């Protein structure tokens, strides 16, 4: 009985959202406001806002009631 990680498999009914760490590489972070040094010190990054916005944009796009 050994634990083994498995990512949460929750259907979003929409286009796949790019990974949080790859947002900068793919060029997403060039279109969101940069976090201030105080925000970075608190642990808030613009990647969080961009990821949340993309997830909300793609959530349930393909869903039918």
């Amino acid at each position: 009985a050994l634990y083994e990680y498995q990512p949460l498999q929750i259907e979003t009914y929409g286009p796949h959202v790019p990974e949080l760490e790859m947002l900068g590489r793919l060029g997403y972070l060039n279109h969101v406001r940069a976090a201030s040094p105080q925000d970075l010190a608190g642990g808030y990054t613009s990647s969080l806002a961009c990821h949340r916005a993309l997830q909300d944009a793609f959530s349930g796009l393909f869903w039918q009631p």
């Binding site: 040094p37 970075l40 608190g42």
Partner: protein, 286 residues
């Protein structure tokens, strides 16, 4: 309504809890904002390691919330000297807490009140995050929060330095403190004030530098501190293996961005290493 009151569970400054039939009922500003927070957040969440909101009702401006009934909490486990916390039990508690927190963070909600008494256990040994009266959504740029969240003993250094903008770290740090309280059976950093909390954190883990925390002095409540060397982690936790020490270090990184997230913590070797987490039915009960 359809609930027969059975026992009086507890009374706090904020609400009173009754065992009723088995569920637990919690009782010019209108309906109280904390109850509304709990209702609005727990209706959108469904996970075995998050407390379930089964029903709610009331009359006039008062309101009652119905939850699953819980046998005990982690605080009673820690403070019970008769209970022996094996590494398997600690790993099980940590795993369940981190799975609940991963589900919570994935839905962009910070608990902001993590502590042993807010980690409830049922008679099947399933740990659930409870007391969502301080929980709030995160990831919104314009949404600015207060830094007085989390109990002081479990408050992260960024919060103690007055961070208004923050992320999952304020939970993960608390998680680390909980983990420490699981290993030492006593509060890790029992400060009596914000200054005392920061002093204890720096005297135990070392005073952070620019390398450890690049934007530390940018926080509006940053205080300069005497350079402390900090006690090495293996000295504080003499019974902790290398994997557990790596987990602790990841949870106690001063940089909140560098601090490990719930998913990264779950992926660490500590949880996949032997021994496996104790099954929920085999977890100790007080």
């Amino acid at each position: 309504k359809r609930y027969e009151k059975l026992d009086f569970l507890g009374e706090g400054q904020f609400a009173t809890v009754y065992k009723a039939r088995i569920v637990a009922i919690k009782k010019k500003d209108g309906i109280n904002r904390t109850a509304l927070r709990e209702i609005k957040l727990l209706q959108e969440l469904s996970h075995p390691n998050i407390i379930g909101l089964l029903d709610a009702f009331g009359h006039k401006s008062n309101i009652s919330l119905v939850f699953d009934f819980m046998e005990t909490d982690l605080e009673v486990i820690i403070k019970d000297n008769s209970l022996v916390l094996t590494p398997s039990h600690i790993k099980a508690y940590m795993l369940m807490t981190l799975q609940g927190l991963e589900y919570l963070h994935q839905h962009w909600i910070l608990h902001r009140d993590l502590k042993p008494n807010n980690l409830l256990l049922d008679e099947n040994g399933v740990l659930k995050l409870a007391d969502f009266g301080l929980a709030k959504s995160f990831g919104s740029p314009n949404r600015a929060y207060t830094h007085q969240v989390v109990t002081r003993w479990y408050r992260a250094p960024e919060l103690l330095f007055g961070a208004r903008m923050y992320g999952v770290g304020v939970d993960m740090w608390a998680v680390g403190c909980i983990l420490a309280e699981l290993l030492l059976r006593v509060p890790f950093l029992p400060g009596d004030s914000d200054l005392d909390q920061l002093t204890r954190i720096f005297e135990t883990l070392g005073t952070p530098t620019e390398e450890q925390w690049p934007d530390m002095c940018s926080l509006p409540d940053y205080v300069t501190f005497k350079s402390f060397p900090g006690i090495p982690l293996h000295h504080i936790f003499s019974a902790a293996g290398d994997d557990l020490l790596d987990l602790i270090q990841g949870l106690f990184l001063f940089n909140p961005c560098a601090r490990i997230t719930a998913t990264q913590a779950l992926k660490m070797k500590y949880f996949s290493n032997r021994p496996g987490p104790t099954p929920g039915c085999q977890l100790p009960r007080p």
